Design a protein around this nucleic acid. Sequence first.
RNA 1: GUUUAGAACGUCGUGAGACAGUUCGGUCCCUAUCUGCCGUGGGCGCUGGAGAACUGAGGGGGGCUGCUCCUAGUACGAGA
Length: 132
Amino acid sequence: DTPILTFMNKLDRDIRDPMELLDEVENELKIGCAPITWPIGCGKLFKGVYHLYKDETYLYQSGKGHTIQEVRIVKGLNNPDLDAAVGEDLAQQLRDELELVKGASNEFDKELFLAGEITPVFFGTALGNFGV
RNA sequence: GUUUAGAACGUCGUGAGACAGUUCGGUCCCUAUCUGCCGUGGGCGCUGGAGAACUGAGGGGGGCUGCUCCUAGUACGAGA
Ligand SMILES: Nc1nc2c(ncn2[C@@H]2O[C@H](COP(=O)(O)OP(=O)(O)CP(=O)(O)O)[C@@H](O)[C@H]2O)c(=O)[nH]1
Ligand SMILES: [Mg+2]
Ligand SMILES: [Mg+2]
Ligand SMILES: [Mg+2]
Ligand SMILES: [Mg+2]
Ligand SMILES: [Mg+2]
Ligand SMILES: [Mg+2]
Ligand SMILES: [Mg+2]
Ligand SMILES: [Mg+2]
Ligand SMILES: [Mg+2]
Ligand SMILES: [Mg+2]
Ligand SMILES: [Mg+2]
């Protein structure tokens, strides 16, 4: 019963719709999950990640995966600067995706983590040096 | 290179000589009349004469392409 905290690697290339991916994890291999970061669209249009507990959002520039890049933050969910920085292409999907996952999934508590019933995730991309 | 006159080899003929056999040497002229083409002028015309600036029927010129980087090690692919 060691603790475990997954990390959805290889987010640059077209992924399965992440929500069923989370459900497939927390039911096929019974561990139960609770995300910490949610990605703003995937593939050719993966733009940034939205932290859930820092309540901000980051941005990702491709082809920089050989040095630590500087973070650009658009802090605040409903801040219209985001909808002008990602676009209603994905923001309007982000809002209801969050409000569909927060209600229907679990939250994070360290003590339950240190027994193996809740594992937080962290989305990101290894070649993009982004989620690490 | 072939295709004259000199000379030697192999082969053929008694011989002069001969061989799409080989080998060394060996005189290549022309001031452009007409058509054609490239440039550049004189005459007359265009409806009184002269100095400039245009329009544009038409015609010609030009049109080649390699490596590198971003998108991206993405789509595709079990991987390479
Ligand atoms: N775009 C992208 N590709 C990735 C990323 N991480 C891994 N890959 C893919 O996987 C390759 C590297 O695989 P690697 O992480 O070394 O695998 P491994 O687990 O060591 C292989 P083994 O199971 O034998 O130990 C890359 O060349 C690429 O094709 C990532 O963050 N982004
Ligand atoms: Mg001759
Ligand atoms: Mg002779
Ligand atoms: Mg001589
Ligand atoms: Mg003469
Ligand atoms: Mg004639
Ligand atoms: Mg002539
Ligand atoms: Mg002429
Ligand atoms: Mg002239
Ligand atoms: Mg004239
Ligand atoms: Mg014309
Ligand atoms: Mg022409």
